[PDB]
Amino acid sequence: QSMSFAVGMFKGQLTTDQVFPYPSVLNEEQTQFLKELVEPVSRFFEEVNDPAKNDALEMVEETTWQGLKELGAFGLQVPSELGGVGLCNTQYARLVEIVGMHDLGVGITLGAHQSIGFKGILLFGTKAQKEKYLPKLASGETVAAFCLTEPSSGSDAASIRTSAVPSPCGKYYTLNGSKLWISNGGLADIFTVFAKTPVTDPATGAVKEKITAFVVERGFGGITHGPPEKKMGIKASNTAEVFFDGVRVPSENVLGEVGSGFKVAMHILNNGRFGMAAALAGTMRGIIAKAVDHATNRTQFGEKIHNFGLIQEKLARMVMLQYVTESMAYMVSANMDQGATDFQIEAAISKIFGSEAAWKVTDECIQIMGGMGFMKEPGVERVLRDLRIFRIFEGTNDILRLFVALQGCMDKGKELSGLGSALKNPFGSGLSLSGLVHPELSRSGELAVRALEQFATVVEAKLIKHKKGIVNEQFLLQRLADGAIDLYAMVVVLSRASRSLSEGHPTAQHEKMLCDTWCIEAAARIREGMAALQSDPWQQELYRNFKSISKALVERGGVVTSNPLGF
Amino acid sequence: QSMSFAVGMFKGQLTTDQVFPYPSVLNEEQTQFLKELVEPVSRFFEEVNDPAKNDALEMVEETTWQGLKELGAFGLQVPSELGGVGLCNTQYARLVEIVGMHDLGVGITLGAHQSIGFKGILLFGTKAQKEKYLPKLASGETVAAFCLTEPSSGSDAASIRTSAVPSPCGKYYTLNGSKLWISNGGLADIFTVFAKTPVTDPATGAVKEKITAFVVERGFGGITHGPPEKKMGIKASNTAEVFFDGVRVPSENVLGEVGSGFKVAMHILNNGRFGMAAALAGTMRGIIAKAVDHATNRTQFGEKIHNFGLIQEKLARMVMLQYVTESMAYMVSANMDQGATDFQIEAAISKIFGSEAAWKVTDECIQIMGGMGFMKEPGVERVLRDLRIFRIFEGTNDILRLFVALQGCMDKGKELSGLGSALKNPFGSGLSLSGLVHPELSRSGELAVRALEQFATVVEAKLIKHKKGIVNEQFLLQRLADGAIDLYAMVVVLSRASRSLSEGHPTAQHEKMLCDTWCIEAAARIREGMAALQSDPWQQELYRNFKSISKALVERGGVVTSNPLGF
Ligand SMILES: Cc1cc2nc3c(=O)[nH]c(=O)nc-3n(C[C@H](O)[C@H](O)[C@H](O)COP(=O)(O)OP(=O)(O)OC[C@H]3O[C@@H](n4cnc5c(N)ncnc54)[C@H](O)[C@@H]3O)c2cc1C
Ligand SMILES: Cc1cc2nc3c(=O)[nH]c(=O)nc-3n(C[C@H](O)[C@H](O)[C@H](O)COP(=O)(O)OP(=O)(O)OC[C@H]3O[C@@H](n4cnc5c(N)ncnc54)[C@H](O)[C@@H]3O)c2cc1C
């Protein structure tokens, strides 16, 4: 049985081991060590890094770049014996939130390096590969890049065309292709590269093309890159095309098993995924301070504007989004640290939620600031520009919603299918969070359980209706993913606030209020959303019309109607 | 009785004169003249203007600037006898949509000039003032700017501090102050300036400070400006502080009546307001073509992506937003052309709706484009940056929502108050759009009427509950404004699509579908929103908590909670 809450909720189960009580994973020595790192990392970003300058220069300033190498920032999760800082996922989350608060451009360059660029060596490396490569990766002497995307292939990784052909001797592969929009592509000396290779079936010998992952050194020869791409935001992060022309890659540089490269890619992206929410929780914390400062000090209509309801609601909504995001990030990191093997749905939810939350929070900060928010000097517009890409890379949020919905449906579908399987021989809910949620949160706990039942009822009905065809019911899948996102958000804040109440933390009553306020509205979204899927007779009309309207646009090449004058 | 649909709907009335049938205002000669202008204006923007270049240079290229003067673009609504092109509001809307489609930076510089910068001379000018100033304004020899905002005063125009003191002789006023974020402030030779002046009461002689509007020439002396402000978008538009130091303004340069300057400002902003929706309808038309092109031609997962439901729904929603916006823009312009005196609520709705629609449409275009959408070359990110300010200037959308809700409530409140007024002498719905909506749209017509009844029921209940105190119930006012916005959107598209059906226009069946699809979801938002206001026992809990959460943030100066680790 899966220990994943998200897997369980699609089946109408409460599987709470990875959610309650809100996890604590650090020992006393890890806690003290982390404290001694937070201080210097924070001072570095406060005193040495200049995010506006990096944005203006479209690169990280050299003194900052060298300082980050010295700080250990290129190898935070590399074991100390291999030249790194040796942090676990929860410790890493804490430092990533500092970087996210201060400079997302620096954040993406460091994350492209270690969250995904050489992460596969950490996850799948042999002892030889780890010992050869990790020390110089950790010091930043060799920068890394994750090389998957191609001109033809972004969301559909399985469709990549870069190829790696084995030598007759078996000693090397010859790699040919090009990769697109690679973070650090122009800086990296080590590339994790995904390429199609012929793979022999162990039983029959039949050869089939499958993806294999490779660790590639720039020094192998035949590797060049294009000029830095100009983009809306994260301008300090290098993004370049990378070209592989007749590159000889030693057979011992295969990462994992030949033909298992798609799995390697997906595991890397999954493993790294919590880091986005961690970073963005930090972004939001800094942005909220800016908005609150503005609202505290701006007089309009005879009062400071924090005295007006419209501003109060904006600020309240911002902090709820920050708290949910941060709670998700640390829950997933803790689950990883505690040895969870099934967290992919939760990680995807955290990425979707955190990226969209940070976008909304920063957009509302601009609105609170008024005309000032649109100006360059305050720096908020720079953060908005940086944020836009987080909804697109590391899995587009649209594809991640489909993933969440289909992955959640999978085990329920399997159960349902098992029902009518056996041959005929003719010849002879009770669900509750009582005891897990703190008593002061019992009502919100009940809202969550009722919402879970509503959700699971629709999941079952739609799987019975659509069976394996549900994969093509995208309008429905997006709406189920949204239910799933809100349900996980509810339980994560219920868990966090419950622990705060049980432990008598000083902010526990404020957290209770954040949780209750979040849960009232999330429960209503799930109720209304599930009713729209199950019992609304106009929902199918909407779906038919979305398809018809879009078809008409495509036939025309744009808007079909003229303006009212007709010309 | 008011002829405004929006005024009526707050009272539970269907006042349809300014909505059905969808207005047509141009005569045959105006139509032909407009056609002969659309062609050269479109070619100019296609062949001469370069929006990416203007953005990069942070100014309009000189050849473009001079070309626009030659094209007549600085005086579109100035009568031909006074040097202009002589267009009515509906003709102006048609040309503004071209500019909005191509270059919002150019759009704001031209709009700051004529939609608001000298608009007060058009609306309130004496014959002498019109004849003296309009010819050089229309040719672009003298650029104009609207000078209201100050460091202390943005949304609260009544609080401005710039002063104008009359001379003993009465021949001039001495103007002193500074204005902030003035579009064309560094380019203009003519300023409409709002300043506090002493005003004598005609009856008692008592002096009170009130705002007066002035036409100010740079050549009067004492006027300087600051350097161009750097900003997120519309970078080609000049934005500068303007300083008035001991400026002698002739008494004959008062615009309108002494002390009536607040009214003058509000009328200018109201009169100009439809132009925003017109421009943004054009922006959206161009952006939708870009998204549709991308979706038509991008293969992913073995198909062109327009074959996937998620993309279909995005595209359908984009065109519905464009169609609503465009329909609103031309309805308000037609109402103005036909002599409506009560259109301020509708104009505000159009500004709110169009600015938020264009933002959402462009944001979704980026999402459809994937990583490409974040890059500079495609130009979509530039349009997103340009759009952000449209939710803030010309009235912040938050203040405009409060305006819509309170202005709509006003006449209903007056009626309710009249009920318990008379002294006691002790000594002796049926509403229907039948006959207005086309029969093929009868169901959607009924949705609109039911939604109007739901809305008006809540308006009445809340006015009885809160009376004049409703002005401080901002959470409620925002939610009523949203209902009003959706209700007007429904009837505008019902009206437009009905005319298309009645006239047998070639796109009528597509328009019917746009209308029906829009109305199903808008009706549901109004139903759920009104139920939340009237019958939801947790709504007051949410409001109390928004205020409590915000208060706690303000006390702290930002987020109250630490991260889960506590440090
Ligand atoms: C600044 C930047 C940095 C990046 N960093 C890296 C990096 O370091 N390494 C790397 O390998 N890549 C990197 N990427 C690539 C990024 O991950 C991809 O852009 C992303 O995966 C989207 O792929 P795409 O742009 O090809 O869009 P597509 O996959 O073409 O998708 C286009 C649109 O269609 C939608 N869509 C696609 N398929 C479906 C479907 N079946 N059903 C419904 N909707 C669908 C998508 O959600 C999207 O909205 C980077 C990109 C950028 C811009
Ligand atoms: C590029 C640019 C060009 C501009 N062009 C011009 C121009 O040509 N001429 C000119 O005069 N001005 C111009 N403006 C100014 C613009 O109109 C103002 O910025 C706008 O009116 C907002 O005022 P503010 O920035 O002072 O915000 P504030 O009024 O301080 O408002 C701040 C925030 O508080 C909210 N708020 C304020 N009061 C209340 C309340 N009572 N209840 C609830 N919420 C409230 C607002 O909605 C906003 O979210 C320009 C500004 C910019 C940035």
Q: At A391, which amino acid appears?
A: R
Omega prior to B21 cis, within 30 of 0: yes
Contact B440, B512 (CB under 8 A): yes
Region of A93 on the Ramachandran plot (φ > 0 left; ψ -120 to 50 alpha; else beta): alpha
Residue A498 lies inside a defined structural domain of this protein:
yes
Q: Are residues A308 and A396 located together in one domain of the fold?
A: yes
- The total number of structural domains in chain B stands at 4
Instruction: Take residue B550 and report the two structure tokens written for it.
Output: 């915000």
Check if B316 contacts A (Cβ < 8 Å): yes
Q: Are residues B10 and B48 located together in one domain of the fold?
A: no
Instruction: Take residue B387 and report the two structure tokens written for it.
Output: 């759009």
CB contact under 8 A, A559 and B288: yes
**Measured between alpha carbons, how far is A367 from A482 in angstroms, rounded to an integer?**
26
A356 part of the active site: no
Residues 6+ apart with CB under 8 A from A317: A364, B546
Across the interface, of B306, B552, B558, the residue whose CB is closest to A550 is B306
Q: Are residues B247 and B319 located together in one domain of the fold?
A: no
Residue A563 lies inside a defined structural domain of this protein:
no
> What is the per-residue DSSP string for B412-434?
HHHHHHGGG-SPP-TT------B
The alpha carbon of B82 is separated from its chain's Cα centroid by a whole number of angstroms, namely: 27
Contact A58, A386 (CB under 8 A): no
Among A143, A174, A199, the domain-final residue is: A143
Question: Which one of the listed residues A394, A440, A460, A511 is annotated catalytic?
Answer: A394
Q: Which residues are registered as beta bridge partners of A164?
A: A175
Q: Are residues A353 and A400 located together in one domain of the fold?
A: yes
Q: At B222, which amino acid appears?
A: G
Residue B566 lies inside a defined structural domain of this protein:
no
Name every protein residue with a CB atom under 6 angstroms from any ligand 2 atom.
A 298, 300-301, 305, 308, 310-311, 367-368, 370-372, 374; B 112, 145-149, 154-155, 181-183, 231, 239, 389, 392-393, 396, 398-399
Backbone angles phi, psi at B2, to 5 degrees: -75, 145
Instruction: Take residue B528 and report the two structure tokens written for it.
Output: 């759920």
Q: Which residues are registered as beta bridge partners of B145?
A: B191
- The answer for B 167-196 residues in CB contact with A (under 8 A) is 180-181
Contact A176, A162 (CB under 8 A): yes
Closest to B356 (Cα-Cα) out of B400, B316, B315, B417? B400
**Measured between alpha carbons, how far is A176 from A244 in angstroms, rounded to an integer?**
5
Q: Are residues B433 and B397 located together in one domain of the fold?
A: no
Instruction: Take residue A192 and report the two structure tokens written for it.
Output: 């994790």
> What is the per-residue DSSP string for A126-140?
-HHHHHHHHHHHHTT
**Measured between alpha carbons, how far is B235 from B105 in angstroms, rounded to an integer?**
6
CA-based angle A404:A405:A406, to the nearest 5? 95
Backbone angles phi, psi at B170, to 5 degrees: 85, 5
A interface mutation test: which of B360, B545, B551 has the most A CBs within 10 A?
B545
Range A464-471 contact pairs with CB under 8 angstroms and sequence separation of 24 or more: A464/A416, A467/A413, A467/A417, A468/A413, A470/A406, A470/A409, A470/A413, A471/A406
Region of B90 on the Ramachandran plot (φ > 0 left; ψ -120 to 50 alpha; else beta): alpha
Among A111, A143, A175, the domain-final residue is: A143
Contact B287, B314 (CB under 8 A): no
Q: Which alpha helices (H) appear in A338-441, and where do they start and end?
A: 344-369, 371-374, 380-387, 397-417
CA-based angle A448:A452:A458, to the nearest 5? 150
CATH classification of the domain holding B76? 1.10.540.10
Query: Domain range spanning residue B413?
Result: 1-22+259-422
Contact B401, A423 (CB under 8 A): no
Residue B564 lies inside a defined structural domain of this protein:
no
CA-based angle A276:A278:A281, to the nearest 5? 105
Q: Are residues A94 and A157 located together in one domain of the fold?
A: no
Contact B261, B215 (CB under 8 A): no
How many helices, marked H, and strands, marked E, lie in chain A? 19, 10
Element (H, E) at A267: helix A261-272
- How crowded is residue B136: how many other Cβ atoms within 10 Å of its Cβ? 17
CATH classification of the domain holding A360? 1.20.140.10
- For chain A, the straight-line distance linking the first and the last C-alpha, in angstroms and rounded, comes to 64
Closest to B355 (Cα-Cα) out of B233, B260, B441, B189? B233
**Measured between alpha carbons, how far is A311 from A309 in angstroms, rounded to an integer?**
5
Report the sign of the C-alpha dihedral through residues A14, A18, A19, A22, in that order. positive
Nearest CA to ligand 1 atom 14: A181
Q: Are residues A416 and A498 located together in one domain of the fold?
A: no
> What is the per-residue DSSP string for B449-505?
HHHHHHHHHHHHHHHHHHGGGGGG-HHHHHHHHHHHHHHHHHHHHHHHHHHHHHTT-
CB contact under 8 A, B319 and A553: yes
Element (H, E) at A476: helix A474-502
Among B116, B143, B170, the domain-final residue is: B143
Place of tokens 């912040």: B396
**Measured between alpha carbons, how far is B533 from B540 in angstroms, rounded to an integer?**
9
CATH classification of the domain holding A179? 2.40.110.10
Q: A186-199: b or e for each residue (b if 16 or more CB lie within 10 Å)?
A: bbbbbbbbbbbbeb
| Nearest CA-CA distance, residue A488 and chain B, Å | 17
CB contact under 8 A, A376 and B155: no
- How crowded is residue B448: how many other Cβ atoms within 10 Å of its Cβ? 27
Closest ligand by atom to B369 CA: 1
Q: Are residues B184 and B209 located together in one domain of the fold?
A: yes
Residue A250, CA atoms < 13 Å, CB-side half-sphere: 7
- How crowded is residue B51: how many other Cβ atoms within 10 Å of its Cβ? 20
Residues 6+ apart with CB under 8 A from B70: none
Contact A62, A89 (CB under 8 A): no
Q: Are residues A206 and A267 located together in one domain of the fold?
A: no
- For chain B, the straight-line distance linking the first and the last C-alpha, in angstroms and rounded, comes to 64
| Nearest CA-CA distance, residue A134 and chain B, Å | 29
Contact A394, A441 (CB under 8 A): no
Residue A188 lies inside a defined structural domain of this protein:
yes
Check if A66 contacts B (Cβ < 8 Å): no
Can you give the resolution of this entry in Å?
A: 1.5
Contact B260, B212 (CB under 8 A): yes
Closest to A140 (Cα-Cα) out of A85, A194, A193, A180? A85
A interface mutation test: which of B499, B513, B540, B549 has the most A CBs within 10 A?
B549
Residue B563 lies inside a defined structural domain of this protein:
no
β-pair type (A190-200, B239-250): unpaired
